[PDB]
Design a protein around this ligand. Structure first.
Ligand SMILES: O=C(O)c1cc(O)ccc1O
Length: 130
């Protein structure tokens, strides 16, 4: 396996899953909580896992991102390759809704409802770390 940073184009923050379940974004490339394991359950279905805490990215019924201690339906994301090398991630559990993983410009998480295709918020460049 290979860990990766996920660099949000909106604002320029790496996706971060804090130990408390809080998901936001930091510009600190040293941050321990931005190293992420991607693993494909099925072809276009990934889990995004913290290599420090072993927590999985998830999205709840309101569209808030959290860190789940154990994988579940809420942690499956559909990964699509975009136009200039960036990926988008839409909640499997909420795909009929087009709820995307996204971060605000201030590096806070954008709830799934506030998301739409064409936003820079939802664009993540995977970078192989080191
Ligand atoms: O680049 C922007 O102005 C932008 C900011 C957002 O928070 C969401 C979508 C966008 O297109």
């Amino acid at each position: 396996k290979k860990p990766k940073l996920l660099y949000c184009s909106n604002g320029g923050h790496f996706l971060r899953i804090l130990p408390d379940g809080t998901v936001d974004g930091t510009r600190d490339r040293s941050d321990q909580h931005i190293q992420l394991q991607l693993s494909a359950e099925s072809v276009g279905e990934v889990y995004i896992k913290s290599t420090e805490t072993g927590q999985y990215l998830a999205m709840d019924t309101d569209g808030l991102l959290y860190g789940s201690q154990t994988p579940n339906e809420e942690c499956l994301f559909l990964e699509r390759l975009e136009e200039n090398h960036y990926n988008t991630y839409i909640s499997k559990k909420h795909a009929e809704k087009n709820w995307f993983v996204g971060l605000k410009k201030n590096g806070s998480c954008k709830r799934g409802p506030r998301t739409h295709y064409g936003q820079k918020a939802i664009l993540f460049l995977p970078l192989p770390v080191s």
